[PDB]
Design a protein around this ligand. Sequence first.
Ligand SMILES: [Ca+2]
Lengths: 234, 588, 89
Amino acid sequence: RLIPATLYPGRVILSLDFILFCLRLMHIFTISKTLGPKIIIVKRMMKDVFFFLFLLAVWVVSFGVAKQAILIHNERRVDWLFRGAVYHSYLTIFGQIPGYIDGFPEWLTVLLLCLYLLFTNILLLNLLIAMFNYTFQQVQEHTDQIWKFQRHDLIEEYHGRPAAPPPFILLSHLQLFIKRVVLKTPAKRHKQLKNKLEKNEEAALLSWEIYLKENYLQNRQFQQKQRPEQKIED
Amino acid sequence: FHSKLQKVLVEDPERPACAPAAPRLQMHHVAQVLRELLGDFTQPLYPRPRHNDRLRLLLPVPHVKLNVQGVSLRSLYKRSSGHVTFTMDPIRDLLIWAIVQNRRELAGIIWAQSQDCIAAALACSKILKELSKEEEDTDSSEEMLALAEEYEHRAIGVFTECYRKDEERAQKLLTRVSEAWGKTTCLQLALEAKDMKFVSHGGIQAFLTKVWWGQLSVDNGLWRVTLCMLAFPLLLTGLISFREKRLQDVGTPAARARAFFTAPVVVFHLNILSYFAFLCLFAYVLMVDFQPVPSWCECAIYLWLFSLVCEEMRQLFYDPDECGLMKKAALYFSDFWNKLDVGAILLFVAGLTCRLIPATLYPGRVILSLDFILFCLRLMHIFTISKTLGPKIIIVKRMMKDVFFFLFLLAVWVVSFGVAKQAILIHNERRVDWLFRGAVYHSYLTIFGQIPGYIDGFPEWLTVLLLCLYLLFTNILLLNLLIAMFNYTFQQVQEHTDQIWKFQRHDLIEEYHGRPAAPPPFILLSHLQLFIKRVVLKTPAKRHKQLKNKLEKNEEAALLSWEIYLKENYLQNRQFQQKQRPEQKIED
Amino acid sequence: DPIRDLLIWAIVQNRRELAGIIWAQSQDCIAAALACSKILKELSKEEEDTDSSEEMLALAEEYEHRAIGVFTECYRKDEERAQKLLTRV
Ligand SMILES: [Ca+2]
């Protein structure tokens, strides 16, 4: 975007770079309870899509040249040779058989229309259905609970942030980095909401939890005895 | 089985192969029908040929000296075979007689003193799985399905005992000839009985990861193994080390080279690269160098593909024994991926002649374009490598084997649209041969939503509706059948069909590690390493590709006594959890 | 702490019920049950190869279930002290 010789990739690369922020955008907007778990469904999808990229990138290539093997078209100049044989022939997977261009055994491509159409839908879009059949377990009942597990995992990451905005966080960096030159060793206000334990505070607590543990100790063996399978074992 | 033997007694009566007589029940008659109850095995425990020929012992034809009758060892002829005492193994034979009489628990007692600790349980699992499928028709065939899985589970706990203590001897245990069960190397039986829980048992997966390497062990990554493939001095850096180089035994660059050839993956990763480059230059010669004279690239496009015809031929040399020709080819034309390997060369017979005959140069480009798809089928069959990759290609086996009419169902359903849409109007983008083309090809290009805007660019409510009517049973009849055909492959998917991928994994790795490391342009030199070896020799006994284990008899007795000692060490353990079953105690 | 160390020596010898008896006098009422749940989940995944690794998957979920009923006891009575309980050093 700054070198004048490559200003076309100044718009092209940063357009692709916007997609990489869009990935984190979904990663940061997966907030609520109905929202959350299915972004993780498209983790185990998308971690498995990493070849379904290349499987697509294998499967597309055998179509557009083969369709233009019927005829090498004429919407074409010296550098639209390598473009028209490729880019017009491989824009066609949004159903976009290039009407831009034109606008003896002819039974073959009538069939070959469906032959590629078959294992688009069979090989890639039953694999839509098949890759769903890896994330098929404890879905409403317990993977929704796995959302609550990763929820506070992220909330401690994102409540553990200074409240200054990113244009005002360099001032908060200057609240800490030139604090290091008037101090020596890092002992400043670190972000933590922990609990410091007085030893007399512990003994009032931990004796009661152990007293609750013996209060639970009779209760855990009780339902072991209240198990009717124990009684027929008795 | 007894109804089979009386049929076998008239499948081999007096006339065809027992020329004096055979109306009465003999051992080889049971062995021949035990031979169909095995597959790729040898013939154990029940010796068949002229040294124990139990086929003709009913009418007087003379003894040992003339070899035409009997066993040629027992020097007395009294209408039997004498006291051929304990022919190979008595207890292994009682495993047969209980299961062919369907004696369930007593064969497990015969298992408790069976010398074959492991593969005999698969032998009680394999035929009983066939007898599940062959004939009981109800109430026992379903039961011996549930019995063979416990008989498989009998074989699992044997490997539990041997692998947890001195696994080095248990490493050999899956490679023995063992002189007992037609050697079968203990995996070729395990690959035949389909053994869905047995081959996915734990330390076996720890063991097949040691078959996965040799002198080329772990701490090598998938990204950095390809960097040492193309770059030969990069292998000599601080990157990938051998077991020799770990022990500092690489003192020769040829030893750094020749051990690199012997990998299960380096041969395979050359088939990743050098095979796929033939598919890419295929488009380059087709777009540009379509010239009917043999050019420098047209001479180059033959150097890879005819050698690939010889690769499956070289695989066909690795198929048979030293006696079989037509049956091993008959097994080759039964596998569906090997049925798809026909057309990839078949249209290259037709389309290349079209590429050379000037009168048919348009099919010289059309047929070979369709022939590229047939290599694409094998391309998916060869790139279905990794664990996340593998099982769903087999999902689109039971899809695609069921798609074989969904081709024609599509080929029924499309046809009723495009003529019917052009029944509204027969269009005008048309000449004398675009009549048959414009009424068909423009009207049947329309299933990529491609209602032909090329062409144009009283109850009109009907096709407004008929737009949706065809659209309905495209999505209803064919694309709920998308959902419906998924509902045949719906069982044990993440948990156990993924284990079925591990089952077919080493099935393929023994096929593809069992290859010479020469590339297909250099394999004709390796054919000349073998075929003009046949003219300086006489009989095939050269270096055959096999990683088996030869068993010294004193080596066996140190091993097999310990496995039997481990079997009695397991024998108390199997009955213990039967007693530790609480349902046994309320039965007590 | 001696009793917290006997929780290790039973599980690294795969002693199932005796560690639960060591749990019955374990001073760490809550996080020790997760400590018998965490490493036993690794030892499920690391190496037993059959018949116990699957069992200690089914044991760690009860060892997790051991830790659940501890929070059942503390939160239902004086949850204010149980509010601190998830923040102690
Ligand atoms: Ca093959």
